Amino acid sequence: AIRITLYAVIFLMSVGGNMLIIVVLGLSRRLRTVTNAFLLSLAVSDLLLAVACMPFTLLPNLMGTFIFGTVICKAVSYLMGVSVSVSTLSLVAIALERYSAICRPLQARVWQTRSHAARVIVATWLLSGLLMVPYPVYTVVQPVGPRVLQCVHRWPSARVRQTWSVLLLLLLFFIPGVVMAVAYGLISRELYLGLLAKKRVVRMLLVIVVLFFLCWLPVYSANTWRAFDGPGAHRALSGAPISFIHLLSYASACVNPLVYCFMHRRFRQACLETC
């Protein structure tokens, strides 16, 4: 269908421009800061999302079978969990650190240093790994039918399955979503009050939150529906429908390079300096 063209465009942009961001933020060209360190971490997470998710989730839907093996399935499941958790927690980290940089700027002058940026980045990566240990512990590949492999997430008790599902839902979508929403609302409010074209980038601060919910809501809602409903949840969301839902999520990995980095002129100047 049309899914393959959109997956190809999103892969092309979200690998090309994202690796360009990783290259530019790699060598310090006087435009690397605390928030640029957080953008480097988010770019690594989104590149891992782009290279680990979309060809490896499209094919179980586009071909209907999992060509790869069980150890590949578990490693890609670890990549799934670590990349989604690091991407959401890194977005929240950029939100909270902008909330410290513009609201209460003296505390930013006190403790907003690159050492703190590295400490927070390492903390989110380690927490993501620890929380998503059960993701390759329990992604046992089961032959579904005669000769079809699907990488089912078998859990020992159902109660554990929906308990972990709601744990993921609150700890990666609900609480991170409300934290980033509150943080950028406070940034917009103190932009209006504390200090005009900044009122015009309040539009960008709005899209960073409402578009984030728009991109990331169907994935978590579908997975929660899978967790409780069980039998029959797959039949409504198999094929192209779910293969578009994840595309919205990967559109998130498509829009993160465009908004923080590519929109502003400073990164264009960094691009010119790199050349």
Binding site: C53, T57, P60, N61, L62, M63, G64, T65, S77, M80, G81, S83, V84, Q142, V144, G145, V148, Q150, C151, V152, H153, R154, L168, V219, N223, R226, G230, P231, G232, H234, R235, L237, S238, G239, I242, S243, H246, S249
Partner: peptide, 17 residues
């Protein structure tokens, strides 16, 4: 295509992300 379930009422999950 690729019906994650390929059967009826098997409750066989799919990749969350």
């Amino acid at each position: 295509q690729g019906p994650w379930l390929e059967e009826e009422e098997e409750a066989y999950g799919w990749m969350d992300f």
